[PDB]
Design a protein around this ligand. Structure first.
Ligand SMILES: NC(=O)c1ccc[n+]([C@@H]2O[C@H](COP(=O)([O-])OP(=O)(O)OC[C@H]3O[C@@H](n4cnc5c(N)ncnc54)[C@H](O)[C@@H]3O)[C@@H](O)[C@H]2O)c1
Ligand SMILES: NC(=O)c1ccc[n+]([C@@H]2O[C@H](COP(=O)([O-])OP(=O)(O)OC[C@H]3O[C@@H](n4cnc5c(N)ncnc54)[C@H](O)[C@@H]3O)[C@@H](O)[C@H]2O)c1
Lengths: 312, 130, 312, 129
């Protein structure tokens, strides 16, 4: 056999923009090569830089699985340094950030290990990242049981974005996305908030507290920010509800003025996740004269490349 | 009332307060699990007053409130209408209760019929007539 | 210049299980071929049959884009016939089923047609299905405006699944999923209900009505059904929130006893949408001795093959 | 509680949102399409609470307007937190709360002439002479 302490040897390490500083010229390498994704990378890095300059509403929309990687600390850094000022994500992002902010350690694993051996050892596998049982569900359950009674006493019916600030308020991890968002008053819009460990534990405690969520207030906030901004931009990683919701609300201002999409899904199955910028013209969620770019690749490779370019 | 127990201690037939109403537990199901947290139970119960099905999922160590039961024995004097007047065998006292509007009860009624009524949390309910 | 009525020529036509009776033996053809998807089709077909005999809780989980195709009529028929008795889906399923139930006609298009041209002609493109502007946003906005007052007067705070029944109660389309779910009292669980045209219109009318959604009640229903069932099965099409939410709640009963997954997503990017059933054995979300099958392919091809096999 | 439509609202108009009369400070239009009909987002300040309230609705949506019922009066007592006012027309001396605003909390003195508006069942001071 292989014992637990062999598997959980090397924790996943969060990175920051500082780790990418010495590679800030790497886009020049792909510009020279110019193979099939280099145009998307070259145009994406330029669109990102222009978005930081000319867009006062800047979206960071991403799927949950990224937050189990070292990219979690990068997104906290990007929020801390003012690159993005609204987040649209999923309940899985809250689970991972809460678990890793309150002592839950994630460990480097492998795709080629026996998964049945993990269930015996009480380890979740996510990609090739190992999440011990007591590092994920135990932590989120403890945190919600501990802090919700005080939060619910203050406000019995609460928008989801305020609830996430309240939990961001109580985080001390400086690599935490929820902490970074709360420190900067950056709203975290999670329409599917009831999905996951955090949402399930909210529901469990709602049986004992006079506590409710009003997602109509999260809708009101994102609606108000979209209407009252001048230009809007987005870095949209992945597909699903967090991509659609970002694109959906920007339709009320004739679309995102700047957009960079990083995805692996393709278009032939008609999914929203794999829908090209030459798909949102029909849904008029992109301006008639706008700068949009799609890069097909793994986020843990493409995103550090794009983010390093921010320091060029 | 409000005596306190844990969810894991509840079994079928026990009483528990759910959403403010005392309920009789009719089903209990366990989940060992662990991806969402500690071992949990799901109790299904029927409200004593409203008759509605109330459910509660919680960790087995979660604290819940139990109603305190008061099984009194009384007898009816008058019928008049909407309510009926009953006298407790002990602690001489006249009071009024509703017709149990179910059919198995409220069609057993007659003057000087001995009944057994339970008192929980500040309300009473008729059970048997014989 | 191309004209509108040239493009909106052939409406999308819903099918039902009737149309697949001729092809009820077709799995034998792929069994003989024993192509790469053939084992998943053969095994998935058997699991579906065993699921109907043996599982008292039977999930139908799917992404929204299918409800823009002729498959919408098929899913309504599978519900009316009792093959599945709980649905987990997304906000876009509500949009498409409400739009098409109240006179919104979807038309056959193509993947090529220039999208800037469609924006001029007030047409959305979804895959290769053309959705005229007046068929989608106008219809949903009128329908919510008309019926929410009465619904909100009856119940000022309502579960999402009860809201969808109230709209199913008012539909006359016999190809409608929401109508089928109402007729059978099959709950439709939509954690991300606020994402879409229906949810946006709910929010708009919530400004003028004492009306709120309590998604914690949707949570109680699916939790209660999972705990109280003997065995559970699921046909899961696509990934995203609807797949994860189905799998998440069945974890409380050791996992899904039967499951068939139809998806195009892959695993190398670590997403939930592309996670095999070999994954989620670490998430303790499938039984130690369970019959699960995954088929990789377009749902408009795989699902009619699997559904036809129900009639063999 | 007179009525109008959202598209008729402009900056400076008055409208009831969440039950409170509000003064419109921003109106933003959105073109037609995927969401539905043409819509407007109005941003308004609560006259009493001072809170920012927003309403997004189709331009033809019916909304309620409060009626201002402007009056002019004078103060008799000082009473600290509460103030006893005499309406120039019709006497009807009544008690209200001091304006917590900076420019109005100063210039307060016995027999000071003020202008108070009466909207929906609650009065508010605006100026003082
Ligand atoms: N980390 C987890 O697996 C996890 C944990 C708890 C809850 N959840 C829930 O799973 C649901 C899934 O939601 P979703 O659809 O937004 O996310 P998803 O995982 O289903 O991904 C959807 C799309 O994002 C793209 N994508 C994902 N990761 C990518 C990457 N590294 N690089 C490029 N593209 C990538 C894929 O094209 C994929 O088709 C959420 O509701 C979430 O609450 C997930
Ligand atoms: N028709 C639309 O695309 C539409 C319309 C309105 C709202 N929305 C909203 O967008 C969000 C998207 O969430 P989602 O992830 O559930 O939808 P999605 O279209 O992004 O599907 C994601 C995954 O489903 C799978 N998939 C999609 N189509 C498939 C097919 N034909 N065959 C096999 N597999 C397929 C892919 O693996 C894909 O990665 C939802 O919240 C929804 O309410 C979508």
């Amino acid at each position: 056999m292989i014992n637990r302490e062999d598997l959980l040897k090397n924790p996943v390490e969060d990175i920051a923009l500082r780790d990418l500083e010495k590679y800030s010229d790497i886009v020049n390498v792909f510009d020279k090569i110019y193979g099939f994704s280099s145009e998307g990378i070259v145009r994406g890095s330029k669109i990102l830089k222009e978005m930081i300059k000319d867009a006062d509403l800047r979206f960071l929309s991403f799927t949950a699985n990224l937050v189990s990687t070292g990219l979690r600390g990068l997104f906290a850094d990007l929020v801390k340094r003012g690159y993005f000022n609204i987040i649209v994500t999923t309940g899985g992002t809250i689970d991972h950030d809460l678990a890793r902010s309150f002592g839950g350690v994630y460990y480097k694993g492998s795709f080629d290990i026996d998964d049945a051996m993990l269930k015996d050892l009480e380890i979740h596998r996510l990609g090739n990242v190992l999440v011990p049982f007591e590092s994920y569900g135990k932590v989120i359950e403890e945190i919600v049981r501990k802090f919700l009674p005080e939060i619910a006493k203050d406000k019995k019916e609460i928008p989801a974005y305020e609830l996430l600030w309240e939990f961001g308020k109580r985080i001390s991890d400086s690599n935490s996305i929820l902490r970074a968002a709360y420190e900067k008053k950056v709203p975290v819009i999670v329409p599917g908030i009831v999905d996951g460990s955090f949402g399930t534990n909210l529901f469990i405690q709602s049986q004992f507290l006079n506590f409710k969520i009003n997602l109509f207030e999260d809708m009101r906030l994102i609606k108000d920010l979209v209407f009252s901004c001048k230009k809007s931009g987005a870095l949209i990683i992945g597909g699903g509800i967090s991509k659609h919701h970002t694109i959906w609300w920007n339709q009320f201002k004739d679309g995102l003025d700047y957009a960079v999409y990083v995805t692996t899904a393709q278009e032939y199955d008609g999914s929203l996740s794999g829908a090209k910028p030459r798909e949102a013209i029909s849904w008029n969620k992109i301006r008639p004269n706008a700068k949009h770019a799609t890069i097909y690749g793994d986020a843990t490779i493409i995103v550090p490349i794009l983010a390093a370019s921010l320091l060029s | 009332s409000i005596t306190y127990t844990t969810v894991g201690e509840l079994k079928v037939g026990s009483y528990v307060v759910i959403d403010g109403e005392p309920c009789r537990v009719v089903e209990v199901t366990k989940a060992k699990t662990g991806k969402h947290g500690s071992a949990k139970a799901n109790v299904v119960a029927i409200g004593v007053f409203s008759g509605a099905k109330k459910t509660l999922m919680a960790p087995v160590d979660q604290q819940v409130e139990v109603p305190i039961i008061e099984k009194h024995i009384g007898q009816i004097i008058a019928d008049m209408g909407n309510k009926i007047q009953v006298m407790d065998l002990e602690s001489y006292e006249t009071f009024e209760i509703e017709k149990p509007t179910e059919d198995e009860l409220a069609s057993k009624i007659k003057p000087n019929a001995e009944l057994e009524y339970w008192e929980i949390m500040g309300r009473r309910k008729i059970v048997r007539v014989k």
